[PDB]
């Protein structure tokens, strides 16, 4: 995760270095919106379910 | 110069054969042939669908062996399968379901006999297991560029044809390449045989075996899930002790996306298994 | 837009012509060939590929390390294509100094004249009278008036001035171009019906340096190797004998090492005789006088005498040049420069 | 109209920006990108193919890369040369009349007044190479300005244009050689030659390649190249014989009299008071060019112009002279 | 589930526009092997998209979505700091020419931080400190004008170092040109600090 630009939508940096713009899912609260966090999207859906400690 | 509103009938035969063929849908190009019967102009029904052996060349007109095709078709003619071929299908993994120049060339060569020439491309590789939405493809005439593209009546089903609304492939390559709607059909034998077969696929053999397993596991294993369930309940109540302060201060607006209600409702639903199975133990003990 | 109008109307057939010629696999170049069916190819992305040859390209038209068009769908070679700038930049066809500039070397000018003039004029006399015409000579040592006999050799050919090659063009960035350079200029030497090729400044490619050892040892493999030709011409020009590898590999094919230091009293008047077609010299000026009034005046030094003296003759605003007007430029340019040197 | 608005499918969403390498006479050119993808497709409309000057950025697509058009893009080329005709002639400066008639006679004889140039049959199309100890464009542009009266001019100042970017190579020298080819009646002026004085290994090979292309091995007499540096010791001895082959001269030390003449020329149009002495002005200076005395003539004319007067008093010109005394000592 | 097709879109890229073109075809600098010039979607105007900024661009349609980002010392200082405490509004009515700033030269034992933060702690106003990186804090002081600004880090022949220092001398000269220039807002009072040849 790189930055959060607004509510319910943010940007996420992929492993290859390219930054991705993906709307986050509504079920996830604002606790997972930490700027320096280990976010994990899906391999196809590219949606985040939970972050890793 | 005439056109109608055609619709491809898809039963569970071709569907499940495209699902096993999708499991065998390796990155290597695969080949298949669809069969059926043409009853009128604007309807097409598929019944028989089989697979073809793979080749190093892949999808091509040279890979289609006419003596093997006609041999298997003749072996279907000596059996109870008096249906002629209606089209050919394949898989396009990774690069999208669109058709390359070779595919449109072998489609142009294979459409000389059948005017319809139904084409279906299955791609279960990147498609999630939630939806199995599949689409059938068609070939447009090159001489129709002056007149309207598709003079197809009954424009109601186009709303159902607008579900594949990818912003690159459909209208990214829609020129000289359109599609057609897909509907299904299910008789009572498939409905009751497959319905009872799936309910039984989620049920037991005698249907009385694994009931007492959980009825008596409520005392051994579920007790741990009940203690942990109470640990989550108290783990939320420790914050619910702090909630009446904020609710006693602001009372305006909601900032916490957590509801703290439906999760506890679900905990009660998992806790009601003891109540629902207590009567089961009462029946097993009674008679 | 006016240029795009007729081509815009001519863009209709580009749709029916877009299906062909679409093949482009980044023009991957091959490396070698173990067998005729399978060809080992390497793309620029550091990915080695192998594919069979198509039916549209003959196997005899395949060259080692040749950039050709290749499909990205069938991976076959549809059509080849003919295509550094220094190679064609180094092409030289210009008239220059003739034989009249013999620098006093009575015997040496025959030792090289019998190999630069006679083998071309008498091909049968040297094959029947002997076993083959001579190889060539070797001008080296002190620079002095160097490169004058090179132009003398270029204009000395009675048919067409040939190509000369300097050696200071091989030491550049992206080493390895020397191989293809010498192989394509020797291939063009095969195309020019056994033409003669001159190689100047061997000291700029001889004497880490292993990337240069590739180009100069391969150069020796192309000189001693009689594949282009082993009879036309061999000649190297260097300032120092500190190039030991060409000195130990030269006895195989090169021969007749000679010297050319300075001309004599009767030569400088002949360089003035070739300067009779230079800036206008009045008939009152005697070539023997100006030639005898300057010792140690090699053809390059007196070429600079005519250069600086030409500049002062231009600055004099005169219709013609007179010896009394530029003799100060002569003895100034030889004596004021001879003081420290 | 429809044929003009029908090619929008190629320039639509599947569009990219690539880098063309060269144009082939077979109407299929070769392009490149970050990974160097080479695709050859028959050309289309909206392209020029003549003034395109291959080796720049072009327009590509996500498709088979049919070239639908081109997109031009270099601000550094504009600041290279001046296209105006300054009124400063060879008769506006004195003392070096021979030093200016050597270059005037050197490069004004070709292509102008040709009876003393083409009748001789020499044609040394190399030109002289000078150097000014003060430099700063004042002396070297005061000597090169003689050719700027009635002629096309070409100016190159500083070796920064090679070192301010990645090692593209001598391609910019090829651009100056093609604009000089299309502008043959011109004068090439290279100023502030500090390539080796200021990777470093590539500067030597692009400088020796600059010497190679500057020698004119394939071109006839086309243009006169006049180079101008500041220190003659910075240039290697290898840049001489293939470089300066016509003539060179030396510039005297501007201590008192050359600064008196520079002061007279910089104070000939302006009006100064009677009490303005010269010995203190030519005494307080020490190894100064003309750009700072022109700067104090400008700020002295403006500072004296603050009182709506054009006369420059002595105390105000000493007050502006303090900028000269401080600037060289800072 | 309608958004699930946009999940199947394999996400979207992050576009960065560097130059706008007048032909309604804006080039956008993207990830390497990018640089995809394309016309933006029809529901979003072109002129609003400013160059040199990052935007949201889809990976297939290439459409833009939106823009992205001591009792005597206190007795003598009461007139300097305790004056704007109780009556900040009637400064326009007061015509006694209140001083712009005050200086305190000497050994900074007590009075550099405890006095300014103590009396300013009685003022209950924000206390901005200085702590080239010397102009952005001045822009922050321009944004948050009402405060007590105090020099603490700077308190420690002409030359280039006196020109670079003369940039901050120019900063305080334009502090006398803003403070002594025109009162943009009430309560603008600062405190100087200097102990050496300066
Ligand atoms: Zn494929």
Least Cα separation, residue B30 to chain D (angstroms): 25
Which tokens hold the place of D8?
């929008």
**Cα dihedral E52, E56, E58, E63 in deg (nearest 10):** -70
CA C75 to centroid of ligand 1, rounded, Å: 13
Q: How many CB atoms lie within 10 A of CB B67?
A: 7
**Cα dihedral D58, D63, D65, D69 in deg (nearest 10):** -50
Nearest to E60 among B126, B130, B167 (CB): B167
Residues 6+ apart with CB under 8 A from B30: B21, B24, B51, B52, B54, B59, B90, B91
Query: Number of residue pairs across B and E with CB atoms under 8 Å?
Result: 18
| Residue of chain E whose Cα is closest to the Cα of B126 | E8
CA dist B191 and B179 (Å) reads: 29
Buried b (16+ CB within 10 A) or exposed e, D243-268: bbbbbebebeebeeebbbebbebbbe
Q: CA E57, E61, E66 angle in degrees (round to 5)?
A: 30
CA-wise closest residue to C229 among C190, C183, C179: C190
Q: Breaks in chain D follow which residues, C to N over 2.5 Å?
A: 73, 198
Are the beta carbons of E13 and A11 separated by less than 8 Å? no
Beta-sheet strands, E only, within C242-307: 257-259
Q: In chain E, which among 35-74 make CB contacts under 8 A with chain B?
A: 58, 60-61, 63
Let me know if D204 is exposed, middle or buried by CB neighbors in 10 A (0-12, 13-18, 19+): middle
Which tokens hold the place of C252?
């195989």
Least Cα separation, residue E60 to chain D (angstroms): 8
The resolution, in Å, is 6.1
Angle of helix C299-315 relative to helix C265-274, nearest 10 degrees, comes to 50
Let me know if B90 is exposed, middle or buried by CB neighbors in 10 A (0-12, 13-18, 19+): buried
CA A21 to centroid of ligand 1, rounded, Å: 28
Binding residues of C for ATP: 141-148
Query: D135 labelled as ligand-binding?
Result: yes
Residue D146 is classified by DSSP as T
Which tokens hold the place of C11?
């863009």
Least Cα separation, residue B173 to chain D (angstroms): 10
Query: B92 labelled as ligand-binding?
Result: yes
Collapsed DSSP state (helix, strand, coil) of residue C305:
helix
D36 in contact with C at a CB cutoff of 8 Å? yes
| Residue of chain C whose Cα is closest to the Cα of D10 | C15
Are the beta carbons of D247 and C308 separated by less than 8 Å? yes
Question: Neighbours of B (≥3 Cβ pairs closer than 8 A)?
Answer: A, C, D, E
Q: How many CB atoms lie within 10 A of CB C53?
A: 16
CA dist C30 and C65 (Å) reads: 5
Q: Which of B127, B131, B257 has the highest number of chain A CBs within 10 A, making it the mutation to test binding with A?
A: B257
Experimental method: cryo-EM
Question: Neighbours of C (≥3 Cβ pairs closer than 8 A)?
Answer: B, D
Which tokens hold the place of E190?
């600062």
Are the beta carbons of E11 and A11 separated by less than 8 Å? no
Q: CA B183, B187, B193 angle in degrees (round to 5)?
A: 120
**If DSSP states are collapsed to H, E and C, what string results for chain B?**
CCCCCCEEEECHHHHHHHHHHHHCCCCCCCEEEEEEECCCCCEEEEEEEEEECCCCCCCCCCCCCHHHHHHHHHHHHCCCCCCEEEEEEEECCCCCCCCCHHHHHHHHHHCCCCCCCEEEEECCCCCCCCCCCCCEEEECCHHHHCCCCCCCCCCCCHHHHCCCCCCCCCCCCCCCEEEECEEECCCHHHHHHHHHHHHHHCCCCCCCHHHHHHHHHCCCCHHHHHHHHHHHHHHHHHHHCCHHHHCCCCCCCCCCCCCCCHHHHHHHHHHHHHHHHHHHHHHHHHC
Which tokens hold the place of A49?
């379910």
Collapsed DSSP state (helix, strand, coil) of residue D311:
strand
CA dist E148 and E169 (Å) reads: 19
- Phi and psi dihedrals of B248, rounded to 5? -95, 0
Least Cα separation, residue B164 to chain D (angstroms): 19
Are the beta carbons of D13 and B168 separated by less than 8 Å? yes
Buried b (16+ CB within 10 A) or exposed e, E132-162: eeeeeeeeebeeeeebbbbbeeebeeeeeee
Collapsed DSSP state (helix, strand, coil) of residue D262:
helix
Residue C48: which H helix or E strand, with range?
A: strand C48-52
Which tokens hold the place of B56?
């190093």
Residues 6+ apart with CB under 8 A from D108: D146, D147
Residue C111: which H helix or E strand, with range?
A: helix C108-116
CA dist E165 and E158 (Å) reads: 10
Query: D18 labelled as ligand-binding?
Result: no
Give contacts of B101 with chain C, Cβ < 8 Å: 19
Taken as a whole, chain A contains a residue count of 53
C19 in contact with B at a CB cutoff of 8 Å? yes
């Amino acid at each position: 995760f790189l930055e959060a630009v607004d509510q319910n939508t943010a940007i996420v940096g992929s492993t290859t270095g390219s930054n991705y713009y993906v709307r986050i899912l509504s079920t996830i609260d604002r606790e997972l919106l930490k700027p320096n966090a280990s976010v994990a999207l899906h391999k196809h859906s590219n949606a985040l379910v939970d972050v890793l400690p | 110069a005439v056109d109608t509103a055609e619709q491809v009938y898809i039963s569970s035969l071709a569907l499940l054969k495209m699902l096993k063929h999708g499991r065998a849908g390796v990155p290597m190009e695969v080949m298949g042939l669809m069969l059926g019967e043409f009853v009128d102009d604007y309807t097409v029904r598929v019944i028989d669908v089989f697979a073809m052996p793979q080749s190093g060349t892949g999808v091509s007109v040279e890979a289609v062996d006419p003596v093997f095709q006609a041999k298997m078709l003749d072996m279907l003619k000596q059996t109870g399968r008096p249906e002629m071929v209606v089209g050919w299908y394949h898989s396009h993994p990774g690069f999208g379901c669109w058709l390359s120049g070779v595919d449109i060339n072998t489609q142009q060569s294979f459409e000389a006999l059948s005017e319809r020439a139904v084409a279906v491309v299955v791609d279960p590789i990147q498609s999630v297991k939630g939806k199995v939405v599949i689409d059938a493809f068609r070939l447009i005439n090159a001489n129709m560029m002056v007149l309207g593209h598709e003079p197809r009546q009954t424009t109601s089903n186009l709303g159902h044809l607008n579900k594949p609304s990818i912003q690159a492939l459909i209208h990214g390559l829609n020129r000289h390449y359109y599609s057609i709607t897909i509907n299904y059909r299910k008789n009572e034998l498939e409905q009751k045989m497959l319905l009872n077969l799936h309910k039984k696929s989620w049920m037991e053999g005698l249907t009385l075996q694994d009931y007492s397993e959980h009825c008596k596991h409520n005392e051994s294993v579920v007790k741990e899930m009940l203690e942990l369930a109470k640990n989550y309940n108290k783990a939320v109540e420790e914050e619910d002790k702090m909630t009446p302060e904020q609710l006693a201060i602001k009372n305006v607006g909601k900032q916490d996306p957590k509801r703290h209600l439906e999760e506890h409702v679900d905990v009660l639903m998992t806790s009601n298994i003891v109540q629902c199975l207590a009567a089961m133990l009462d029946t097993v003990v009674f008679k | 837009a006016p240029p795009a109008l007729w081509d815009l109307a001519a863009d209709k057939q580009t749709l029916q012509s877009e299906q062909p010629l679409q093949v482009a696999r980044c023009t991957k170049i091959i490396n070698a060939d173990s067998e005729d069916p399978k060809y080992i190819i390497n793309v620029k992305q550091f990915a080695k590929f192998v594919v069979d040859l198509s039916d549209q390209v003959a196997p005899t038209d395949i060259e080692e390390g040749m950039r050709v068009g290749v499909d990205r769908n069938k991976y076959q070679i549809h059509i080849p294509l003919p295509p550094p700038t220094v190679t064609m930049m180094q092409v030289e066809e210009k008239p220059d100094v003739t034989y009249s500039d013999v620098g006093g070397c009575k015997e040496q000018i025959e030792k090289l004249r019998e190999v630069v003039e006679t083998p071309l004029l008498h091909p049968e006399r040297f094959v029947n009278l002997g076993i083959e015409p001579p190889k060539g000579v070797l001008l080296f040592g002190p620079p002095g008036t160097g490169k004058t006999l090179c132009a003398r050799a270029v204009a000395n050919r009675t048919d067409a001035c040939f190509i000369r090659v300097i050696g200071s063009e091989l030491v550049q960035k992206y080493v390895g171009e020397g191989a293809r350079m010498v192989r394509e200029l020797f291939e063009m030497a095969r195309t020019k019906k056994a033409c003669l090729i001159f190689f100047d400044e061997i000291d700029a490619i001889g004497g880490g340096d292993n990337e240069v050892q590739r180009t100069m040892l391969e150069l020796i493999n192309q000189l001693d190797g009689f594949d282009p030709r082993g009879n036309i011409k061999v000649l190297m020009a260097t300032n120092r004998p500190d190039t030991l590898d060409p000195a130990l590999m030269r006895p195989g094919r090169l021969d007749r090492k000679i010297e050319f230091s300075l001309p004599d009293l009767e030569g400088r008047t002949h360089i003035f005789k070739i300067h009779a077609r230079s800036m206008s010299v009045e008939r009152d000026i005697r070539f023997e006088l100006l030639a005898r009034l300057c010792p140690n005046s090699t053809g390059a030094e007196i070429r600079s005498v005519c250069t600086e003296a030409g500049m002062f003759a231009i600055r004099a605003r005169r219709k013609i040049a007179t010896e009394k007007d530029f003799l100060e430029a002569v003895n100034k340019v030889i004596k004021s420069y001879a003081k420290f040197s | 109209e429809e044929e003009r608005s029908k090619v929008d499918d190629l320039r639509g969403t599947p569009m990219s920006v690539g880098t063309l390498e060269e144009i082939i006479d077979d109407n299929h050119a070769i392009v490149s990108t970050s990974v160097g993808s080479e695709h050859y497709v028959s050309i289309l409309s909206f392209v020029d193919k003549d003034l395109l000057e291959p080796g720049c950025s072009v327009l590509l697509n996500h498709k088979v890369h049919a070239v639908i058009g081109v997109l031009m893009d270099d601000p550094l080329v504009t600041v290279m040369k001046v296209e105006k005709a300054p009124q400063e002639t060879y008769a506006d400066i004195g003392g070096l009349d021979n030093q200016i008639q050597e270059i005037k006679e050197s490069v004004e004889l070709p292509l102008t007044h040709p009876e003393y140039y083409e009748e001789m049959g020499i044609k040394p199309p190399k030109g002289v190479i000078l150097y000014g100890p003060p430099g700063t464009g004042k002396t070297l542009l005061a000597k090169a300005v003689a050719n700027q009266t009635s002629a096309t001019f070409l100016r190159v100042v500083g070796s920064e244009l090679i070192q301010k970017y990645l090692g593209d190579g001598p391609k910019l020298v090829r651009e100056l050689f093609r604009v000089a080819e299309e502008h043959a009646p011109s004068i090439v002026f290279i100023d502030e030659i500090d390539a080796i004085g200021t990777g470093e290994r590539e500067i030597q090979r692009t400088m020796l390649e600059l010497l190679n292309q500057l020698d004119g091995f394939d071109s006839r007499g086309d243009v006169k190249v006049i180079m101008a540096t500041n220190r003659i010791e910075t240039l290697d001895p290898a840049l001489i014989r293939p470089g300066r082959i016509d003539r060179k001269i030396e510039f005297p030390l501007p201590d008192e009299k050359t600064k008196k003449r520079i002061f007279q020329i910089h104070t000939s149009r302006m009006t100064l008071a009677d009490d303005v002495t010269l010995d203190d002005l030519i005494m307080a200076k020490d190894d100064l060019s003309g750009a700072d005395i022109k700067a104090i003539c400008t700020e002295a004319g403006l500072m004296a112009l603050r009182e709506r007067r054009m006369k420059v008093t002595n105390e105000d010109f000493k007050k502006s002279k303090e900028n000269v005394l401080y600037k060289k000592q800072e | 589930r309608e958004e699930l097709q946009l999940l199947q879109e394999q996400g979207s890229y992050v576009g960065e526009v560097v130059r706008a073109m007048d032909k309604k075809k804006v080039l956008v600098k993207v990830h390497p092997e990018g640089k995809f010039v394309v016309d933006v979607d029809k529901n979003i105007d072109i002129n609003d998209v400013t160059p040199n900024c990052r935007v949201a661009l889809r990976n297939d349609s290439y459409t833009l979505h939106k823009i992205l980002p001591l009792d005597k010392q206190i007795k003598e200082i009461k007139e300097v700091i305790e004056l704007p405490v109780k009556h900040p509004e009637l400064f326009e009515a007061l015509g006694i020419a209140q001083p712009k700033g005050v200086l305190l030269y000497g050994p900074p034992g007590t009075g550099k931080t405890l006095l300014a933060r103590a009396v300013a702690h009685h003022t209950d106003c924000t206390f901005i400190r200085v702590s080239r990186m010397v102009r952005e804090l001045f822009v922050m002081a321009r944004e948050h004008a009402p405060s007590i600004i105090f020099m603490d880090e700077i308190d420690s022949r002409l030359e280039g170092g006196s020109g670079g220092d003369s940039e901050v001398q120019r900063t305080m000269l334009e502090l006398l040109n803003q403070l002594d220039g025109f009162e943009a807002t009430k309560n603008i009072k600062v405190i100087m600090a200097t102990n050496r040849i300066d």
